[PDB]
Design an enzyme around this catalytic site. Structure first.
Site, PDB file in Angstrom:
ATOM      1  N   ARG B  59       0.840  -1.196   0.000  1.00  0.00           N
ATOM      2  CA  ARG B  59       0.000   0.000   0.000  1.00  0.00           C
ATOM      3  C   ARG B  59       0.866   1.233   0.000  1.00  0.00           C
ATOM      4  O   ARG B  59       1.787   1.341   0.802  1.00  0.00           O
ATOM      5  CB  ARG B  59      -0.911   0.027   1.234  1.00  0.00           C
ATOM      6  N   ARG B 106      -5.400  18.819   7.582  1.00  0.00           N
ATOM      7  CA  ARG B 106      -4.167  18.676   8.360  1.00  0.00           C
ATOM      8  C   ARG B 106      -3.731  20.007   8.953  1.00  0.00           C
ATOM      9  O   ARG B 106      -4.086  21.072   8.452  1.00  0.00           O
ATOM     10  CB  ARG B 106      -3.031  18.101   7.510  1.00  0.00           C
ATOM     11  N   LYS B 256     -12.971   3.386   0.465  1.00  0.00           N
ATOM     12  CA  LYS B 256     -12.726   3.406   1.901  1.00  0.00           C
ATOM     13  C   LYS B 256     -13.893   4.076   2.603  1.00  0.00           C
ATOM     14  O   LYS B 256     -14.242   5.207   2.285  1.00  0.00           O
ATOM     15  CB  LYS B 256     -11.449   4.171   2.226  1.00  0.00           C
ATOM     16  N   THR B 314      -7.393  -0.580   9.991  1.00  0.00           N
ATOM     17  CA  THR B 314      -6.459   0.224  10.778  1.00  0.00           C
ATOM     18  C   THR B 314      -6.291  -0.186  12.251  1.00  0.00           C
ATOM     19  O   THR B 314      -7.239  -0.599  12.914  1.00  0.00           O
ATOM     20  CB  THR B 314      -6.841   1.704  10.633  1.00  0.00           C
TER      21      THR B 314
HETATM   22  K   LIG Z   1      -4.660   8.444   2.987  1.00  0.00           K
HETATM   23 MG   LIG Z   2      -7.840   7.953   6.823  1.00  0.00          MG
END
Ligand SMILES: [K+]
Ligand SMILES: [Mg+2]
Ligand SMILES: O=P(O)(O)OC[C@H]1O[C@](O)(COP(=O)(O)O)[C@@H](O)[C@@H]1O
Ligand SMILES: [K+]
Ligand SMILES: [K+]
Ligand SMILES: [Mg+2]
Ligand SMILES: [Mg+2]
Lengths: 517, 517, 516
Positions: B59, B106, B256, B314
């Site tokens: 990945r 971010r 996702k 995760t």
């Molecule tokens: K990402």
């Molecule tokens: Mg994420």
């Protein structure tokens, strides 16, 4: 609400597919929560807050601390608990549980050269001694241990694990009272760290001289249950029974399964014991880590068959010792333990010494409640009846009838009048959706009720006031008010009530479907 | 072996009770393993070791790094992978996967330092700016952000989360291009840290200008699949399709699910997508942490119904970033993900930056294999056929027949000749015990095969025989040798073989039960 | 009782575990309905039929006068009350009125009613409505009840007589006549029933005669009504009205005898208190091969709804002339019970045959065996699973009791009930154990026979003032019944359903109690 859409499906797979994050659960949470007490949670002030956050049982770890220390912890637990006693509708009983030291092996203390941890490196040599001269002088070259006969029960090529299965050593040279080892995977080494020797016949007794003193102390202090460490066989459970004796005969024995022999001889042990703990800490070192989940699910299943309580124990929220929120793996772990069918879930370090004891308790509360809503009750109950052996005990039959009746009318609760606890335990084993409000005048059975899933113990402080018919009605109405207060149901809702035909244990035989007044 | 005792039971509960830690599994491991690449795993030397440890997919996280950086990572993956190409019997394909940045928010940098840090304390004030003057001047008093319209989509009293939900802020005063917040729970704050705003209608596009460039770059670099971040709806999946275009039409899109809308509109999205990732990192912040397990199990279930791949993502082994061995909760998490029915399991920090990338990969390998043995195949397959919609596609019908035949003779494997991969995918969705050896000359379908559980892709490098009958026999025999070599079966064992009646995709219709030569 | 058989995890394994050397329990749950006539009308044989197992007596109003039926009832009640001296051993016996309905019949053949005429394949037969021929039927001319037959029948239509045994094809339609070719023949008697499948017959479900009979039924205090040829819910409503407020407690069982009735079955089940699968007319009105489907559909839906279903006609035909039934007939009865029928019926077998008692006894014997052969885990499990969550306490108490009964393998479920409903609610969930329904209402005692597994028990003792001891009295009465009839012994375990106060609708209390 409570994913009633999910529990209607005809397959497990369709049940899974129908799970809904926007379907909130009921206010009742059934899985008990056991919190280990220590520095971070010993104060009466935080104990009060922990009771409020969801703590049901307080675990005392006798692998550490003196009898004086533990005596004071108990004092505080009982202070904080009884601080809510003024309002018996809102008073939550809180059990006290004594975890034994058991036959555990620990290291000594490090030098106290500047920072009292020592780096151990992959490939390096490390000499293990039993020479008491070094018991407070451990370092990267010399390491001391509790276990006297370690040299007798360990080969060259054997593996030794020093702390929480994180440091690993290979024995290169056996001596008389020493060993020479190569560090396989290293890390920093602290003091008084637990040691494991998988695939080694350790000859330490399941019940030491210290363990006896502690158990006798437990009886004195009026503890509710005993978590017995490193139970290898039924004979070991019998030793503990004897030590508790006639004075401590009502104290429940929960055998901790921490090792290979324990798992092999599990049935033997379950029969001898009142309950089981899946103690993953030592277990996951004593057997391969990948096999733990199998052992966990096997044991939980067999306990649910037998109708005896099972506890899922260690590292459920480790992350939260240092952080205010758990990992995704940890949330998963808790939820799955409840789905596996655990009666209780436990926190050790998370509440004994961590920075976020309350958040950890609250988190277990929250997940358990969600997981309970996600249970496929039709398949579970159906499988439990089908495995339930036909018997002419009336309590047994009344219990099943009630549970069945509870599903049928989607009752707000099952109210059960019980002296010894057994009538409520018998409803619990068949796993109703609805909460079991167990009314009792015996404050020990109230505290011990927390071991069984779905029992909300409720201590009637009122005197045996009138004639036994109105004494029942009084007690039933008390529960009725509890449920209304704690938000389990409203006036007009429907509720199942279990009573006897006369006073005393063993006479429960009467189920009534009753509207809430 | 493989807990054949456990899978014979008539109830889930009896199946659970029959689980056995002393029953070892088969050498085949079916759940795919996806490893995030970074500093700790970028070198060709460790990539080789990671392939050997079990890595199936690599990945690439495009939320960090340049196109030049990622290009070199790919180079190395392909170097290490092709280093085993000399022996095509033992050569394991290895897929390349591009995770998009997506619409992520971010923070800026603290003191021109990539890694300096600032302590944020509970109760303290923290002013958030969008003023680009402060984007590399963050501290305990001022903090900069990517997100332009943050002030428009956030109320007073709203919660803001920084760094995997570990820092939490409450908005006290909204401004025009600033905010004033109180730190709720603090910690140390680093640079370029991800920010979450749950319960807020963020207006960032699922596919930014940067995201387009990266996707186009992915097509150029010949990646096998795309992990699309923060997919809220089918329209978003369609945008990604169009950007890949006709050149990247064979690239699989895995959506996702990282947020509330994504879960609400999940069906919509699954239909548009080739597969799904349960991205617990952002998801567990964007929704309550206690509800993740529900979302996980729902999605895995619905994906298994649909026959499309699902990835559990995760923090499966976070502990192992710093330690050589995982927590008990983490071992539990992996095993349960496989039991839930995940096609693949993933490692992020554990392999991208941690101290123990290889141990983590190996651990996932080990647990997945154990968990697979613990699967109740009769109930699962039975439920999957029962839910399988009657259709006159011959491939579909042939697949089910093969799986069914595989259980009936306890085959060592199901061998499938496939060009596009679809014939093997169709066997996989019905979840056989036996491993699916997918033979192909197309090296992309070999790499993409890793998305589906139980498919062992096998790249035939031999040239095409003119007699398509012997060309089949050649390819079948190649697989036959693979299985013998990798220890899936011996000479004399029985094996299922799926072939077509002629060359090209869509003509698989022939099942043969054949002894191993 | 084949407790080995009912433990299996599959139907197929359950089947394989069936055992002819495993005898059943003494209790028989499926009710037995016997049609009364010449062979069974006498008080002396009625007594013997009660003893052989008769639970309900059926009166066929397609024949006989009001005077005739009045006397039959008289005798049934005489014979029944002949056992009343011992209320522990007294078995209630219900009375049921089957309506004539919109049936078509032929006339008489000669000045002798019971002579016969051979009809041959290929021969011609003229059908008239001319009342001159209504007692002058023969191989050439045949008279009928039905006035509008010519209006609702085509050329090429088929006409059937004598239980579908004679078949005619219409060749020429007339104004008030028809010309037909005999397809398959036989001998033709008098006043023989006629069927016209695939024809919109316009006769009313409730005729003027039917009204008189229903009103007569109310007068005579009958327990239930078997309503013939119910095509739709509107028809059930007509019957309700005619019974009226005086006959409001009389149960209406709709007989499904025709295509429309099956089509509109749900409609009808809702309107009705119960259903009869009337195979006689049904098997003519629809293809004979499809009857079993209709039978099993209806029984299933009735069991879902919790309403009684009766399997009716030709269950033991053979035994009209012979002392033992055919293998097909034994099979039929057993399967009807397994299908899940609350009651099984005998018509000719007991109304006119040579072996009424043997036929009743045979139904008793097979039903009991078939009941032992039931896969109770799968059935109960499927019935709970289909039971709609509801906050009615009686409902929930019933399910709990049944569930508790299996769990302790109770000897019985004792239920105190005034209207019958509390016992009906236990019955729908189909326990293994017998349901002893105690009541002071002798009508609900008689009507209890419609539901499977209810043993009605009439308390003749007067009402104690202390309702607590009045309950205990009634419970103990049932306790003595069970001991006497051999359902359980002292020491056995038993489920008891009571209320918290007097009146219908207050049952909410289940107790698991040892037999004293
Ligand atoms: K990402
Ligand atoms: Mg994420
Ligand atoms: O079954 P039904 O007709 O609804 O009646 C049940 C009734 O029987 C009882 O258990 C007994 O009282 P009765 O004497 O009024 O029948 C009541 O408490 C209950 O309401
Ligand atoms: K301990
Ligand atoms: K009739
Ligand atoms: Mg331990
Ligand atoms: Mg008829």
């Amino acid at each position: 609400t409570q994913q009633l859409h999910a529990a209607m499906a005809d397959t497990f797979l369709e049940h899974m597919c129908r799970l809904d994050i926007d379907s909130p659960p009921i206010t009742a949470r059934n899985t008990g929560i056991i919190c280990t007490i220590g520095p971070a949670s010993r104060s009466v002030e935080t104990l009060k807050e922990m009771i409020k956050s969801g703590m049901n049982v307080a675990r005392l770890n006798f692998s550490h601390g003196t009898h004086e220390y533990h005596a004071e912890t108990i004092k505080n637990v009982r202070t904080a608990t009884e601080s809510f006693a003024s309002d018996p509708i809102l008073y939550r009983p809180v059990a006290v549980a004594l975890d034994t030291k058991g036959p555990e092996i620990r290291t000594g203390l490090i030098k106290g050269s500047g920072t009292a941890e020592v780096e151990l490196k992959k490939g390096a040599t490390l000499k293990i001694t039993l020479d008491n001269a070094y018991m407070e002088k451990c370092d990267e070259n010399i390491l001391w241990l509790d276990y006297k006969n370690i040299c007798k029960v360990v080969e060259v090529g054997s593996k030794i694990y020093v702390d929480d299965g994180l440091i690993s050593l290979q024995v290169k040279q056996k001596g008389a009272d020493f060993l020479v080892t190569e560090v396989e995977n290293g890390g920093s080494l602290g003091s008084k760290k637990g040691v494991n020797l998988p695939g080694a016949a350790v000859d330490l007794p399941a019940v030491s001289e210290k363990d006896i003193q502690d158990l006798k102390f437990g009886v004195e202090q009026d503890v509710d249950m005993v978590f017995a460490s490193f139970i290898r066989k039924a004979s070991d459970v019998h030793e503990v029974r004897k030590v508790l004796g006639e004075k401590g005969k009502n104290i429940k024995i929960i055998s901790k399964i921490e090792n290979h022999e324990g798992v092999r001889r599990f049935d033997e042990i379950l029969e001898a014991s009142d309950g089981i703990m899946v103690a993953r800490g030592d277990l996951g070192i004593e057997i391969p880590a990948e096999k733990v989940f199998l052992a966990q699910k096997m044991m939980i299943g067999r306990c649910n068959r037998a109708g005896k309580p099972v506890i899922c124990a260690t590292q459920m929220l480790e992350s939260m010792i240092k952080k205010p929120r758990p990992t995704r793996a940890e949330g998963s772990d808790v939820a799955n333990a409840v789905l596996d069918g655990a009666d209780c879930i436990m926190l050790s370090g998370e509440t004994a010494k961590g920075d976020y004891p309350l958040e950890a308790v609250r988190m277990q509360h929250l997940i358990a409640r969600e997981a309970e809503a996600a249970i496929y009750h039709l398949q579970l109950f159906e499988e439990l009846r089908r495995l339930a052996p036909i018997t002419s005990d009336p309590t047994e039959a009344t219990a099943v009838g009630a549970v069945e009746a509870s599903f049928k009318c989607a009752s707000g609760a099952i109210i059960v009048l019980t002296k010894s606890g057994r009538s409520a335990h018998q409803v619990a084993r068949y796993r109703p959706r609805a909460p079991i409000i167990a009314v009792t005048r015996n404050p020990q059975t109230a505290r011990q009720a927390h071991l069984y899933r779905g029992i909300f113990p409720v201590l009637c402080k009122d005197p045996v006031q009138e004639a036994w018919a109105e004494d029942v009605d009084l007690r039933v109405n008390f529960a009725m008010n509890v449920g209304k207060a704690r938000g389990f149901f409203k006036k007009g809702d429907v509720v199942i009530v279990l009573t006897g035909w006369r006073p005393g244990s063993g006479f429960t035989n009467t189920m009534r479907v009753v509207p809430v007044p």
